[PDB]
């Protein structure tokens, strides 16, 4: 069932992968047809987490969860706000497997700027993933948005292949964190 | 969150004309603008369509260079200059504003377009 | 030019019956549809977003359901009150193009 996109975030050697019940919050997946014809040639997938699930010590990853969504993904962590501060984010993690490793993430578009403040405190807010062949910086957009799937929300996730030894995360708000990655080999 | 549109009248065949429609209640620079127009007593037929930016603007092929659109997010309006009307362009001309999203619903996804937000509309009658 | 197609043109239940309706496009247009209802003389008003979603302010009568080349529009018990014409409206080149469907007309028994 599950296509693609919620297999990888949680909603066998074969050359071929064969309108199902995908990504509960709405969104979409940045180059989602790069990322299928590399797992066509396969040769071995696994799932090592990577991330703590506690290590946010001054965030809270307990309430994140959506309605439309029924909870949240299991291969990514949604970041709130804890207490009424938001510190800006600096998690660091290195490759130290051995085979190569798919990191993913994501970031969320509020409905509106009343929204954004009630969830991440912070009113101008970023998310800065850097790894050692590329440097990306998104900023979420806000606006009024139709209801899709329950809700109005967004989330637009990206993923990149990590070769061993690092990617450098750095949000100050709306940013899906990963608890759980991918070794391809 | 309402839409005014104005401009409308009775212009002679092979004359010209501009629609006016003001925004109000919603942040105008955010969202896209998407003119509609309903001939008397039938469907709705799309005119053309303008990004947040006034840089990007489609048309609706069938008036392709018969009429330009452009916008202005200082004043919060968005304008429709029309040119050389045919008879077949009197109608109720709508306005209305949609977000487009790029959301991946099913195995792939393509675009998404909707409009939510619709003015009233002024009725323009092109005849003799 | 994508090309749309929405059948009956017109339709005539008694109040109370389950009024469904078909659109249907000429190309693969995955999930990127959208409803509208515009009364007699006012303003057409956006009902369902993406085929099964549904926008804020319509009862829990209406509800759309397809994917890919034709969908269905169906209603649940009609009420005099949803007298209107019903169009849909094509999404998948809304950047360059959509395409507005010939609206099925709902007239009342009584």
């Known amino acids: 069932d599950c296509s693609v996109a919620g297999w990888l975030l949680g909603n066998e050697w074969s050359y071929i992968v064969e309108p199902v019940n995908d990504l509960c919050y709405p969104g979409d997946f940045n180059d989602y047809e790069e990322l299928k014809h590399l797992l066509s040639r396969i040769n071995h997938f696994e799932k090592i987490q990577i991330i703590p699930k506690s290590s946010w010590s001054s965030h809270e990853a307990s309430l994140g969860v959506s309605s439309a969504c029924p909870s949240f993904f299991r291969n990514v962590v949604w970041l709130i706000k804890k207490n009424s501060t938001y510190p800006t984010i600096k998690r660091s993690y290195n490759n130290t497997n051995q085979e190569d490793l798919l990191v993913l993430w994501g970031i969320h578009h509020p409905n509106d700027a009343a929204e954004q403040t009630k969830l991440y405190q912070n009113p101008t807010t970023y998310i800065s993933v850097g790894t050692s062949t590329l440097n990306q910086r998104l900023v979420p957009r806000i606006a009024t948005r139709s209801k899709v799937n329950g809700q109005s929300g967004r989330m637009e996730f990206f993923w990149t292949i990590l070769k061993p030894n690092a990617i450098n995360f750095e949000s100050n708000g709306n940013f899906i964190a990963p608890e759980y990655a991918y070794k391809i080999v | 969150v309402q839409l005014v549109e104005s401009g409308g009248g009775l212009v002679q065949p092979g004359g010209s004309l501009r629609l006016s429609c003001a925004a109000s209640g919603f942040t105008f620079s955010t969202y896209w603008m998407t003119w509609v127009r309903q001939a008397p007593g039938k469907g709705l037929e799309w005119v053309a369509n303008?990004?947040?930016?006034?840089?990007?603007?489609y048309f609706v092929d069938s008036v392709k260079g018969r009429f330009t659109i452009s916008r202005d997010n200082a004043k919060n309006s968005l304008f429709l200059q029309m040119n050389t009307l045919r008879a077949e362009d009197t109608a109720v001309y709508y306005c209305?504003?949609?977000?487009?999203?790029?959301?991946?619903?099913?195995?792939?996804?393509?675009?998404?377009?909707?409009?939510?937000?619709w003015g009233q509309g002024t009725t323009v009658t092109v005849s003799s | 030019d994508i090309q749309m197609t929405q059948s009956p043109s017109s339709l005539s239940a008694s109040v109370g019956d389950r009024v469904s309706m078909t659109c249907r496009a000429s190309?693969?247009?995955?999930?990127?549809l959208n409803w509208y209802q515009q009364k007699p003389g006012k303003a057409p008003k956006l009902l369902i977003y993406?085929?099964?979603n549904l926008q804020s302010g319509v009862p829990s009568r209406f509800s759309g359901s397809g994917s890919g080349t034709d969908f269905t529009l169906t209603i649940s018990s009609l009420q005099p009150e949803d007298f209107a014409t019903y169009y849909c409206q094509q999404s998948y080149s809304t950047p360059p193009e959509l395409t507005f469907g010939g609206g099925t007309k709902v007239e009342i028994k009584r």
């Open positions: 993406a085929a099964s």
């Open positions: 190309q693969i247009i995955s999930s990127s």
């Open positions: 209305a504003r949609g977000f487009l999203e790029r959301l991946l619903l099913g195995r792939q996804g393509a675009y998404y377009y909707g409009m939510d937000v």
């Open positions: 303008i990004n947040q930016d006034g840089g990007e603007k």
